[PDB]
Amino acid sequence: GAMNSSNYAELFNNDIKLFVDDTNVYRVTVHKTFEGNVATKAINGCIFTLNPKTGHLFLKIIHTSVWAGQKRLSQLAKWKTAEEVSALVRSLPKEEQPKQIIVTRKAMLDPLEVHMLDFPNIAIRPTELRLPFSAAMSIDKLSDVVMKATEPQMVLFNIYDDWLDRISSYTAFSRLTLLLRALKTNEESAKMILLSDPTITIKSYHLWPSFTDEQWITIESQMRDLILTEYGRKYNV
Amino acid sequence: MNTVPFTSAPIEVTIGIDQYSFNVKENQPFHGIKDIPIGHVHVIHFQHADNSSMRYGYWFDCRMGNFYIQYDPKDGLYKMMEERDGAKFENIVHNFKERQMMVSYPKIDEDDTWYNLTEFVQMDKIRKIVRKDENQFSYVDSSMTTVQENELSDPAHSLNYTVINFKSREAIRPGHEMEDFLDKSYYLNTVMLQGIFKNSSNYFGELQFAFLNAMFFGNYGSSLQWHAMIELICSSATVPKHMLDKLDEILYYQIKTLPEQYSDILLNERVWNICLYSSFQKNSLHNTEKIMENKYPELL
Ligand SMILES: CC(=O)NCc1ccc(C(C)=O)s1
Ligand SMILES: CC(=O)NCc1ccc(C(C)=O)s1
Structure with missing residues (x-):
């Protein structure tokens, strides 16, 4: 089921798992229109997908063009997250795929479960941990590559450097x-x-x-x- | 009008016939039920006075044969049987009526309740969901599980209901994950209606069969099936207009008939609030929403 304090060491065993955080997928600035109404302008975002054992962050950059002409973007963002994570797993050799994917927000469970029906053996789990992954855009080098992007792109980073x-x-x-x-x-x-x-x-x-x-x-x-x-x-x- | 005679009533039992019920006392002189309307399926069901555990009963259609009830003291239940000797059956029935040892199916002439609960239920289709093909009638009881429940244990004693699972490959088209999960019209109309049922009458018949087994037998898997088939419609943005109007009538008479004190275990709060207040069809079930709100406003 859910990941919490009691089962904290599971994250560092030898079953390949990923955390998915979607909190920076859909990002906007809110501004006043000339008529004095409020409107949003989307800015690039990213999916934060982290193998906690190895340190790898498969940072999928979400370019604002993916929102063009779409409605209900906060709900679309969870499904877009799920679609990209699913694509990543599918891109990977069977021996390198997540045995478990842990989502930091419960709203991602159904989108991801639905996109991963082809992978009945991958456990989609929530967590009770309050993880701070939303602050990933305060890492200068990660923020830079997201804002500079002009098209969808995935950049892998080791988030642990050489630790x-x-x-x-x-x-x-x-x-x-x-x-x-x-x-x-x-x-x-x-x-x-x-x-x-x-x-x-x-x-x-x-x-x-x-x-x-x-x-x-x-x-x-x-x-x-x-x-x-x-x-x-x-x-x- | 048809008759289901009883050999005898050796054990005290509450007997149901469709939505009617009456108490029979141990060895009371009771020889069955008469005046049963032809044209409908029927269910005759039982709850022993000594062990209200296991409600059980038989779905049957009097046009399909001459059926009677005989207690089996070995298996300890009232068993439905078919009499093939038609003259022996006519002879037996006539004697019991003359001695007035039968209760009369007590239909008010204004009362279309039973029709409205069984409009799409067909005994031959009942045999498809409860498999026991050497009998023309079908046994159901409280404990019987469904084929889906068995995936999640005797397959002979199962209710073979159509598998509905919203997070299933059958329900979700590659590339329309979000679309198909949030708007189930593909699953309802193409997979289920066109693909499995063939038409909405068949969809309605399974939905009706599920409700009645939930109500008369407190069969849990049936209640799950009834709710699932409702939610599939309510969660589809594109439903034929006549199906929605018919669904509203079906559910209206189901809610009307449900016992007032059983609503806490037969009605799924989440499904009903979603169906009436949040789903695509939240505005399409006027009669049902009106009877639900005036009878079970607690649930909502
Ligand atoms: C899901 C997961 O962690 N799979 C293992 C790796 C696949 C590709 C990796 C690199 C180093 O590019 S690590
Ligand atoms: C055939 C099947 O599985 N579903 C369609 C039904 C139509 C009528 C039914 C009953 C039980 O009367 S079932």
């Missing part, structure tokens, strides 16, 4: 979720933390800075402080 050479996937996932949670709670503060030291660079090909093990501890602690911080500032504690 798995030094830490486990459990730990790399925990780092990733703390970074994203921080970025989601205060993007300016979070980014300041990540980049305050110009000597630690992001190697062109990676998403995050080349922190040493001890620098990550520091970074991770500061991200915690931030999330505690904004929590007070939010609730006054």
